[PDB]
Amino acid sequence: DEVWVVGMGIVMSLIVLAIVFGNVLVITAIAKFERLQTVTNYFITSLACADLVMGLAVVPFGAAHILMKMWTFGNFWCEFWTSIDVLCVTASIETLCVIAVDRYFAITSPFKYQSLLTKNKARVIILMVWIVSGLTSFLPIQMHWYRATHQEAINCYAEETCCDFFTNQAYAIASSIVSFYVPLVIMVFVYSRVFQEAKRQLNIFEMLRIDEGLRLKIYKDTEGYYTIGIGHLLTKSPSLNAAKSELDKAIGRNTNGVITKDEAEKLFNQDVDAAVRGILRNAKLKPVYDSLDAVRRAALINMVFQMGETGVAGFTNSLRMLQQKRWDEAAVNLAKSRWYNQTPNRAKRVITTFRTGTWDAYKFCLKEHKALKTLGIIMGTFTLCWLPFFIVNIVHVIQDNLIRKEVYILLNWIGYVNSGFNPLIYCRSPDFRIAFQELLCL
Ligand SMILES: CC(C)CCC[C@@H](C)[C@H]1CC[C@H]2[C@@H]3CC=C4C[C@@H](O)CC[C@]4(C)[C@H]3CC[C@]12C
Ligand SMILES: CC(C)CCC[C@@H](C)[C@H]1CC[C@H]2[C@@H]3CC=C4C[C@@H](O)CC[C@]4(C)[C@H]3CC[C@]12C
Ligand SMILES: CC(C)CCC[C@@H](C)[C@H]1CC[C@H]2[C@@H]3CC=C4C[C@@H](O)CC[C@]4(C)[C@H]3CC[C@]12C
Ligand SMILES: OC[C@H]1O[C@H](O[C@H]2[C@H](O)[C@@H](O)[C@H](O)O[C@@H]2CO)[C@H](O)[C@@H](O)[C@@H]1O
Ligand SMILES: CC(C)NC[C@H](O)COc1cccc2[nH]c3ccccc3c12
Ligand SMILES: *C(=O)CCCCCCCCCCCCCCC
């Protein structure tokens, strides 16, 4: 009975520690490492501050309120504590919504993934988020717009040891819609469009960039030949200066061995053009290529890139089955090759692409697309943690007391606890992971 309290207290204490530790770590990492100082991470910092205030100002007293089964901190702080609670939750979803809109314009810009905002504009947006959140949180609570007019509530308001958030229905609807549901619906809609755009970026360039890899500096391939970009051969000569000469002649300037990503893309589009012409000249590959759709043509070109026309022309049975749109059977034969034995991962993705005729095998391979998934996980987690709580707010406007007080409280704490998840989710990023282990003396 009472020993349970200590055990429950230690648990809630660890919850507080977890929230504060992790979010302090996030703030520190972004503030300290110049690498992490991006527009997105400024919003993340704003998001981390809301969670940090939750862990310091909100959760500790909510915990004590439950364990003591009454309020000990007085009416002033009860009203203040309540305001902070609503503020941090509001600012969090508003920030998440800003991230979604920011990421949409970033991914649709010709200046792709660059935020249209500068660092200074971002701070203004952030500051305006906290002003609006405070305007929608503190005002109604400090002006007493939220309060109900029935006696049970009136008693709780007046008595100093009662801190129950009794609200009138108009507030319950309006506040929950404006603070939560409006930025939630926008966030979900906009960031679903972000994923659509991200998926739409997948093409043969990204495919070969994932499968072969893009190298900005001159390197020797497996055969010892000088190569650059996505496996673009410069020369078979052992002279490095001969490669540099061919590179300059191809790119159109003094490169000294180094080219940009966009220039590698330029060379790649030429190599693709060359590959297709060669395919159409090959009597064994032409009928297959002619029959295939655009996506599977990219798959065939991918193979030609890796093995050359001759190596690909040797897949006589597979080519026949591909030509007849017998995908699974083509997949069975292709999986039984030296190709699949040497580069299974790459072969797995190309063969799967032959099977589906989509880019699904190349989802979330790019570092930038992985980063988008991380943000999507942040948003989804926040949604899942808070949605049940806010559904019950509306349900009780329809019919009050349908759901127990203890369940409603538990749904609140699922919301509270969410403030400790984001730091763990950021470990998906190689940059934060590197940042953290530096900060943690590793
Ligand atoms: C009234 C009390 C309880 C609420 C606390 C308000 C604090 C947490 C709010 C108010 C203004 C906010 C900030 C506004 C400006 C930015 C700049 C950005 O680069 C990092 C976050 C940062 C610094 C915000 C984080 C937290 C912040 C300081
Ligand atoms: C409001 C009370 C109860 C909670 C304590 C507020 C603390 C957590 C808030 C208030 C102002 C905030 C800061 C405001 C300014 C920034 C600069 C930014 O580059 C890093 C975070 C940093 C340094 C914030 C971190 C935490 C911060 C200090
Ligand atoms: C009243 C309670 C909430 C206060 C507890 C604050 C804890 C979470 C604070 C107090 C001292 C802090 C640490 C102090 C030293 C560093 C090294 C730094 O490179 C990374 C963060 C790190 C590791 C801090 C993280 C969290 C930390 C442990
Ligand atoms: O065979 C056509 C392409 O071959 C090179 O790119 C290959 C390279 O030969 C090989 O060592 C490696 O395993 O794969 C890459 C591509 O994945 C050419 O220099 C390309 O320009 C040709 O199109
Ligand atoms: C112990 C209570 C005070 N905790 C409140 C929730 O953590 C956050 O609740 C909200 C956040 C944002 C907007 C809100 N509108 C509401 C209407 C009724 C109840 C809560 C909220 C609410
Ligand atoms: C490498 O960065 C790891 C070493 C950092 C150790 C710093 C020592 C922190 C002491 C924590 C005590 C504060 C507790 C506050 C409780 C209210």
206 Cβ contact list (under 8 Å, min separation 6): 362, 366
Assess whether 406 carries a catalytic annotation.
no
- Closest atom of ligand 4 to 302 CA is 17
What residues contact residue 48 under an 8 Å CB cut-off, 6+ apart? Answer: 23, 26, 27, 30, 422, 423
Count of alpha carbons within 13 Å of 333, Cβ hemisphere only?
15
User: What are the strands, taking DSSP E only, across 344-398?
Assistant: none
Task: Tell me which amino acid residue 103 is.
Answer: R
Q: How far apart are the first and last CA of the chain?
A: 43
Would you give the distance in Å from CA 51 to the centre of its chain? 18
Place of tokens 């207290």: 9
Ramachandran quadrant class, 231 (left: phi over 0; alpha: psi -120 to 50; beta: rest): left
How many CA atoms are closer than 13 Å to the CA of 361, on its beta-carbon side? 23
Q: 49: CA distance to ligand 6 center in Å?
A: 20
- As a whole number of angstroms, the distance between CA 99 and CA 416 comes to 21
Instruction: Please tell me the CATH superfamily of domain 1-202+363-442, with its number.
Output: Rhodopsin 7-helix transmembrane proteins (1.20.1070.10)
Quote the ligand 4 centre to 305 CA distance (angstroms): 5
Instruction: List residues bridging with 227 in a β-sheet.
Output: 219, 233
Query: Which contiguous run of DSSP H or E holds residue 4?
Result: helix 3-32
- Do the beta carbons of residue 411 and residue 392 sit within 8 Å? yes
Rounded Cα distance, 408 and 392, in Å: 7
CA dist., res. 415 & res. 14, Å (int):
16
Burial class (CB in 10 A: 0-12, 13-18, 19+), 251: middle
Question: By CB neighbour count within 10 A (0-12 exposed, 13-18 middle, 19+ buried), where does 77 fall?
Answer: middle
Q: What is the DSSP letter of 418?
A: G
235 forms beta bridges with 226
3-state secondary structure of 148: coil
From its phi and psi, is residue 213 left (phi > 0), alpha (psi between -120 and 50) or beta? left
**Residue 442 annotated in ligand binding:** no
43-46 CB contacts, 8 Å cutoff, 24+ apart:
43/95, 43/98, 43/99, 43/102, 43/122, 43/126, 44/99, 44/422, 44/426, 46/91, 46/95, 46/126, 46/129, 46/130
Identified catalytic residue from 212, 309, 329, 431:
212
Listed resolution, Å: 3.2
Q: What is the rounded distance in angstroms from the CA atom of residue 256 to the CA atom of residue 244?
A: 6
> 232 forms bridges with which residues in the sheet?
228
| CA of 142 relative to ligand 1 center, distance in Å | 20
DSSP string covering 29-98, please?
HHHH-GGG--HHHHHHHHHHHHHHHIIIIIHHHHHHHHHTTS--SHHHHHHHHHHHHHHHHHHHHHHHHH
Catalytic residue among 152, 159, 221, 273: 221
Task: Read off the tokens for 255.
Answer: 């490169």
Mark 256-280 as b/e (b = at least 16 C-beta within 10 Å).
Answer: ebebeeebbbbbbeebbeebeeebe
- CATH number of this structure's domain 203-362: 1.10.530.40
The number of the ligand nearest the C-alpha atom of 52 reads 2
- Closest-CA residue to 15 (of 421, 382, 407): 421
Residue 229, Ramachandran bin (φ over 0: left; ψ between -120 and 50: alpha; else beta): left
Which residue is it, tokens 């083509």? 330
Report how far ligand 2's centroid is from the alpha carbon of 49 (Å). 6
Look at residues 229, 224, 263 and name the one whose alpha carbon lies nearest to residue 240: 224
Question: Does 341 appear as a known binding residue?
Answer: no
Give the Cα separation of 242 and 236 in Å (integer). Answer: 9
Question: 221 catalytic, yes or no?
Answer: yes
Could you state, in order of their start, the residue ranges of all structural domains in the chain?
1-202+363-442, 203-362
Q: Which of 19, 440, 442 to probe ligand 6 with, by most ligand atoms within 8 A of CB?
A: 440
Helix (H) or strand (E) segment spanning residue 215: strand 215-220
Judge if the beta carbon of residue 172 lies within 6 A of ligand 1.
no
Ligand 6 atom at shortest distance from the alpha carbon of 439: 2
> DSSP alpha helices (H): ranges in 177-293?
182-200, 204-211, 240-251, 261-281, 286-291
- Ligand 1 near 435 CB (within 6 A): no
CA distance 83 to 357: 53
Give the bridge partners for 220, in sequence order: 226
Q: Is there a binding annotation on residue 412?
A: yes
**C-beta separation of 91 from 51 below 8 A:** no
- Amino acid (1-letter code) at residue 318: S
C-alpha dihedral, 144 to 147 to 149 to 155, nearest 10° = -100
